[PDB]
Write an enzyme that holds these catalytic residues in place. Sequence first.
Site, PDB file in Angstrom:
ATOM      1  N   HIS A  62      11.418 -11.354  -0.401  1.00  0.00           N
ATOM      2  CA  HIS A  62      11.454  -9.936  -0.742  1.00  0.00           C
ATOM      3  C   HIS A  62      12.568  -9.215   0.041  1.00  0.00           C
ATOM      4  CE1 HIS A  62       7.295 -11.139  -2.050  1.00  0.00           C
ATOM      5  NE2 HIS A  62       6.942 -11.239  -0.728  1.00  0.00           N
ATOM      6  N   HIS A  88      14.858  -5.395   8.963  1.00  0.00           N
ATOM      7  CA  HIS A  88      15.073  -5.931   7.642  1.00  0.00           C
ATOM      8  C   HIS A  88      15.627  -4.843   6.742  1.00  0.00           C
ATOM      9  CE1 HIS A  88      10.999  -4.161   7.159  1.00  0.00           C
ATOM     10  NE2 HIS A  88      11.559  -3.827   5.960  1.00  0.00           N
ATOM     11  N   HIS A  90      16.903  -3.223   2.734  1.00  0.00           N
ATOM     12  CA  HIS A  90      16.632  -2.847   1.352  1.00  0.00           C
ATOM     13  C   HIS A  90      17.959  -2.490   0.696  1.00  0.00           C
ATOM     14  CE1 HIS A  90      12.189  -2.978   1.572  1.00  0.00           C
ATOM     15  NE2 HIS A  90      12.437  -2.661   2.885  1.00  0.00           N
ATOM     16  N   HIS A 107      15.356  -1.205   8.070  1.00  0.00           N
ATOM     17  CA  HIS A 107      14.080  -0.816   8.660  1.00  0.00           C
ATOM     18  C   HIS A 107      13.788  -1.601   9.934  1.00  0.00           C
ATOM     19  CE1 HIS A 107      12.546   0.787   4.522  1.00  0.00           C
ATOM     20  NE2 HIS A 107      13.405   1.627   5.159  1.00  0.00           N
ATOM     21  N   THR A 173       6.286   0.255   2.728  1.00  0.00           N
ATOM     22  CA  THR A 173       6.775   0.312   1.352  1.00  0.00           C
ATOM     23  C   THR A 173       6.629  -1.052   0.667  1.00  0.00           C
ATOM     24  OG1 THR A 173       9.028  -0.377   1.707  1.00  0.00           O
ATOM     25  CG2 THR A 173       8.519   1.924   2.256  1.00  0.00           C
ATOM     26  N   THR A 174       5.834  -1.957   1.239  1.00  0.00           N
ATOM     27  CA  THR A 174       5.508  -3.200   0.573  1.00  0.00           C
ATOM     28  C   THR A 174       3.996  -3.348   0.700  1.00  0.00           C
ATOM     29  OG1 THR A 174       5.955  -4.418   2.561  1.00  0.00           O
ATOM     30  CG2 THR A 174       7.784  -4.322   0.973  1.00  0.00           C
TER      31      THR A 174
HETATM   32  C1  AZM Z   1       4.183  -6.947   9.386  1.00  0.00           C
HETATM   33  C2  AZM Z   1       5.150  -5.931   8.744  1.00  0.00           C
HETATM   34  O1  AZM Z   1       5.938  -5.332   9.432  1.00  0.00           O
HETATM   35  N1  AZM Z   1       5.092  -5.759   7.292  1.00  0.00           N
HETATM   36  C3  AZM Z   1       5.917  -4.796   6.602  1.00  0.00           C
HETATM   37  N2  AZM Z   1       5.726  -4.412   5.337  1.00  0.00           N
HETATM   38  N3  AZM Z   1       6.551  -3.415   4.886  1.00  0.00           N
HETATM   39  C4  AZM Z   1       7.421  -2.980   5.779  1.00  0.00           C
HETATM   40  S1  AZM Z   1       8.612  -1.689   5.568  1.00  0.00           S
HETATM   41  N4  AZM Z   1       9.589  -2.069   4.252  1.00  0.00           N
HETATM   42  O2  AZM Z   1       7.931  -0.377   5.405  1.00  0.00           O
HETATM   43  O3  AZM Z   1       9.312  -1.384   6.859  1.00  0.00           O
HETATM   44  S2  AZM Z   1       7.215  -3.847   7.273  1.00  0.00           S
HETATM   45 ZN    ZN Z   2      11.369  -1.996   4.799  1.00  0.00          ZN
END
Ligand code: AZM
Ligand code: ZN
EC number: 4.2.1.1
Length: 222
Positions: A62, A88, A90, A107, A173-174
Amino acid sequence: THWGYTGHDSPESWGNLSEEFRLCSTGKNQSPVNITETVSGKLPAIKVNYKPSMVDVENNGHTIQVNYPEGGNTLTVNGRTYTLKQFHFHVPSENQIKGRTFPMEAHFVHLDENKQPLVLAVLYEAGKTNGRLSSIWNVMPMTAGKVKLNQPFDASTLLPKRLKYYRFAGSLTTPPCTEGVSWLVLKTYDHIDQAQAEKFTRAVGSENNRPVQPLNARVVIE
Ligand SMILES: CC(=O)Nc1nnc(S(N)(=O)=O)s1
Ligand SMILES: [Zn+2]
């Protein structure tokens, strides 16, 4: 359970995939967000205590993410210390500034000692090659998988010196889209060129932005 950004699997159906992702569809404090109206306020200054560390670069299907096996890198906001867990990406951006989508968002995800989540965000404008990311882009797993990077990585190079930010409360956001996540979206923009964004998309297999959710009761502070 499987989720993605397209197919019959897409963000608008995440809540029905299982009972445990339901907040994705039912929450009132969801991320990401279009930051339009704001309140000018006196936000506590950020202090970055990032330094070099031995990281790995993971493709989880993802996103492309950089895992920090040790604390090491912290953020102090408001007399609270938050430990960077991972950062990470996007493509394109999840959060928007006045309707403007950016070509990438980073992020940086943290927990404090209370295990309270804080996400510090960097938005990239189109521009010249990002030299400070090239080190991560060069080892990018192009399928799902994980490589530990030989040379130390320093995340201090990924954050600007001007640390003004928008602040709001939100969510992952996941899936499972857990709420109670502090969001700090830095005003000062970094840059990526076009190859970098395309490669990323190629690696992860799609544009990986959840669409913006309504602010509902929330106020964004600038
Ligand atoms: C364990 C963990 O960090 N899971 C996450 N899921 N979504 C994220 S986000 N795109 O909001 O930063 S981080
Ligand atoms: Zn994120």
